[PDB]
């Protein structure tokens, strides 16, 4: 049983999600005036806080909570170490609503105890193509297309409760208060991901990893040495050779994205993202924010030929604290962000990603099997990992889709 999730406008079982045919809301329609204006009650030793995302010391405070208390692997060997710069970037996109950043502090000393963050996203989330087809056969086209237009909704990330405060039901309260603040801005849907199984995902995808620095990955035990590499003399030289990469990209006309590329990148990205059932819609400003390079945070390259941007790729950095080793403090991981190819095969574009990530000192490259990420797995030597990223809507009935019909990257 789910004492909290059973009370919420989400599908409640796998069975329920498989019978859904049309996209649409679940809840009673409400209005801003229906929503309580006062924050949800919490115990008297705690207070609600709205962090200022431009205050270095507020960012710092959130940074520390997440450094010590955020997502770990199942064997507690790694914990995410999102940087302060990464957090300002993720939390403060264009037109972000400060009130959507929800923190609980200890009233006495103002120690931060819990955090949840919401940012705006414009998302296509209408009935998926296959169901739309089936609806025409059945005569229900107008029903299937009712919510086809991109919607301005909330993207929830960064939910974290301090380890000292776990299992005290503080997360339900955080989610209720975030929901209140979002509803009071006339927004009624949300999208979120989790590694855990909650009621109920509309999509699920496995994680994939590409060793860039296998000696380190083996030392820290992210990776194992293959059983077949044992029947060799010095297996470490063999593993290194297996994963080796050119020192420089193979596409002539690859360079870093610059501000003037914004319109062309937006155009080729939107064309590509348009073919997926679930995907974001970006303005020029959002393309600038989410894709222009920032030191230590986001790395973006375009292929330009004849003065035309024909392809691009992006990746971003999230180091993980290595909990148990001594020789190493950090895993430096690059994550496949957005991309688009028109002039070359995807596998050839993404090799350049690997090449750049490797020469800049990253240890591994990570991705979930959304977009067309599967198309390059075998040739670029990515392996499936333990992780499964699940995708969820709050207050939105949506049929079950393959992860290759998802075009939304979560930070």
Ligand X SMILES: CCN(CC)Cc1cccc(-c2cc(Cl)c(S(=O)(=O)Nc3c(C)nn(C)c3C)c(Cl)c2)c1
Ligand Y SMILES: CCCCCCCCCCCCCC(=O)SCCNC(=O)CCNC(=O)[C@H](O)C(C)(C)COP(=O)(O)OP(=O)(O)OC[C@H]1O[C@@H](n2cnc3c(N)ncnc32)[C@H](O)[C@@H]1OP(=O)(O)O
Active site members: 411
Cβ 150 to ligand Y shortest distance, Å: 16
Q: How many residues bind ligand Y (CB under 6 A)?
A: 35
Q: Cα separation of 388 and 196, whole Å? A: 8
**5 marked as part of a ligand binding site:** yes
78 binds, among ligand X, ligand Y, none (CB under 5 to 8 A by kind): ligand X
74 near ligand Y, judged by CB under 6 A = no
Q: Cα separation of 101 and 87, whole Å? A: 12
Indicate the DSSP class of residue 229.
H
Cβ 180 to ligand Y shortest distance, Å: 9
Among 9, 24, 47, 72, binds ligand X (CB under 6 A): 72
Q: Cα separation of 349 and 302, whole Å? A: 10
Cβ 230 to ligand Y shortest distance, Å: 36
154 near ligand Y, judged by CB under 6 A = yes
172 near ligand Y, judged by CB under 6 A = yes
Is beta strand 151-161 parallel, antiparallel or unpaired with respect to 298-305?
Answer: unpaired
Token duo for residue 175: 């989610």
Backbone angles phi, psi at 56, to 5 degrees: -55, -35
Q: Cα separation of 193 and 411, whole Å? A: 10
Among 61, 65, 190, 287, binds ligand Y (CB under 6 A): 190
Contact segment (CB under 6 A) with ligand Y among 23-31, 64-72, 129-137, 302-310 equals 64-72
Instruction: Find the Cα–Cα–Cα–Cα dihedral 63, 64, 67, 69, rounded to 10°.
Output: -120
Q: How many residues bind ligand X (CB under 6 A)?
A: 21
37 near ligand Y, judged by CB under 6 A = no
**167 marked as part of a ligand binding site:** yes
Cβ 178 to ligand Y shortest distance, Å: 5
Contact by Cβ (8 Å): 312, 302: yes
CA 198 to each of CA 7, 42, 407: distance values in angstroms, whole numbers, following the listed order: 13, 25, 21
391 near ligand Y, judged by CB under 6 A = no
**289 marked as part of a ligand binding site:** no
Q: Cα separation of 292 and 284, whole Å? A: 11
**159 marked as part of a ligand binding site:** yes
Per-residue contact track with ligand X, 209 to 248, x per CB under 6 A?
-------------x--------------------------
**122 marked as part of a ligand binding site:** no
Q: Which of 360, 340, 338, 361 is nearest to 349 (CA)?
A: 340
Cβ 306 to ligand X shortest distance, Å: 38
Token duo for residue 383: 């392996």
Per-residue contact track with ligand X, 77 to 116, x per CB under 6 A?
-xxx------------------------------------
DSSP codes joined into one string, 277-330: SBEE---HHHHHHHHS-BTTTEEEEEEEETTEEEEEEEEEEEEEEESS-SS-SE
Question: Which stretches of the chain bind ligand Y, using CB under 6 A?
Answer: 2-5, 69-71, 154, 156-161, 166-172, 175, 178-179, 182, 187-190, 192, 194, 196, 198, 394-395
* Binding-site annotation: residue ranges for CoA: 2, 4-5, 161, 167, 169, 171, 193
């Amino acid at each position: 049983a789910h004492a909290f999730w059973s009370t919420q406008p989400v599908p409640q079982t796998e069975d329920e999600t498989e019978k859904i045919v049309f996209a649409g809301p679940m809840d009673e329609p409400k209005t801003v005036a229906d929503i309580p204006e006062e924050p949800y009650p919490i115990a008297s030793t705690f207070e609600w806080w709205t962090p200022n995302m431009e205050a270095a010391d507020d960012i710092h405070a959130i940074y520390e909570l997440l450094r010590d208390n955020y997502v770990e692997d199942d064997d507690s060997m790694f914990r995410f170490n999102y940087s302060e710069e990464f957090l300002q970037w993720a939390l403060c996109p264009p037109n972000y609503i400060p009130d959507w950043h929800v923190a609980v502090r200890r009233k006495a000393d103002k120690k931060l105890l819990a955090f949840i963050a919401g940012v705006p996203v414009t998302l296509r989330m209408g009935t998926p193509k296959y169901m739309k087809v089936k609806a025409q056969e059945k005569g229900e086209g107008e029903e299937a297309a009712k919510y086809d237009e991109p919607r301005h909704i909330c993207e929830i990330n960064f939910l974290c409760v301090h380890k000292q405060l776990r299992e005290k039901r503080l997360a339900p309260i955080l989610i209720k208060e975030a929901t209140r603040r979002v509803n009071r801005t006339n927004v009624w849907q949300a999208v979120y991901t989790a590694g855990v199984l909650l009621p109920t995902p509309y999509a699920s995808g496995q994680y994939f990893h590409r060793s860039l620095n296998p000696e380190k990955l083996v030392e820290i035990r992210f990776s194992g040495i293959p059983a077949q590499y044992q029947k060799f003399q010095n297996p470490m030289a063999m593993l290194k050779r297996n994963y080796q990469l050119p020192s420089a990209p193979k596409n002539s006309g690859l360079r870093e994205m610059k501000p003037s590329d914004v319109p062309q990148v937006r155009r080729i990205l939107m064309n590509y993202l348009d073919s997926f059932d679930v995907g974001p819609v970006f303005s020029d400003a959002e393309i600038s924010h989410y894709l222009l390079p920032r030191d230590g945070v986001v790395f973006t390259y375009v292929v330009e030929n004849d003065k035309k941007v024909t392809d691009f790729f992006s990746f971003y950095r999230i180091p993980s604290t290595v909990i148990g080793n001594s020789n190493y403090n950090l895993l430096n991981a690059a994550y496949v962000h957005y991309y688009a190819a028109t002039s070359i095969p995807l596998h050839q574009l993404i090799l350049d990603l690997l090449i750049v990530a490797h020469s800049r000192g990253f240890d591994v490259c990570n991705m979930v099997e959304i977009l067309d990420n599967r198309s390059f797995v075998e040739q670029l030597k990515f392996g499936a990992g333990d992780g499964h990223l699940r995708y969820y809507f709050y207050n939105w009935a949506y049929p079950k889709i393959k992860p290759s019909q998802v075009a939304l990257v979560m930070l």
